[PDB]
Amino acid sequence: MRLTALVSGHVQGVGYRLFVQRYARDLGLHGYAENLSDGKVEVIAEGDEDALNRLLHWLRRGPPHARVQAVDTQYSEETGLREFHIY
Ligand code: NA
Ligand code: NA
């Protein structure tokens, strides 16, 4: 399925997108991570349900110096995205 996750907290400017991309690639997932102008990070990830749960473990922690306060999740059908990009 597709996970669309919205990450709140001290998350921009701390390498969060690169962190997500590394773990998504480790977990066989495709999609993207993008900074939002309201201060959040949006993560779209497509792939197996358990891999999405493993990614969520990382999304809730973030890199060194991130302070992730919450991760809102919503699920939808995969669209066939390839690769994992940062925007
Ligand atoms: Na980054
Ligand atoms: Na961005």
Curated annotation (Swiss-Prot):
InterPro entries in the cross-refs: Acylphosphatase (IPR020456), Acylphosphatase-like_dom (IPR001792), Acylphosphatase-like_dom_sf (IPR036046)
Domain of life: Bacteria
Reaction(s) catalysed by this chain's protein: an acyl phosphate + H2O = a carboxylate + phosphate + H(+)
PROSITE patterns noted in UniProt: ACYLPHOSPHATASE_3
UniProt-recorded Gene Ontology molecular function terms: acylphosphatase activity
Annotated Acylphosphatase-like domain residues: 2-87
Active site: 17, 35
Keywords on record: Hydrolase
Enzyme Commission number, as recorded: 3.6.1.7
This protein's record includes keyword Hydrolase: yes
Entry keyword annotation includes Hydrolase: yes
NCBIfam families associated with the record: PRK14433.1 (NF011007)
Family classification: Belongs to the acylphosphatase family.
Protein name: Acylphosphatase
Species in which this protein is naturally found: Deinococcus radiodurans (strain ATCC 13939 / DSM 20539 / JCM 16871 / CCUG 27074 / LMG 4051 / NBRC 15346 / NCIMB 9279 / VKM B-1422 / R1)
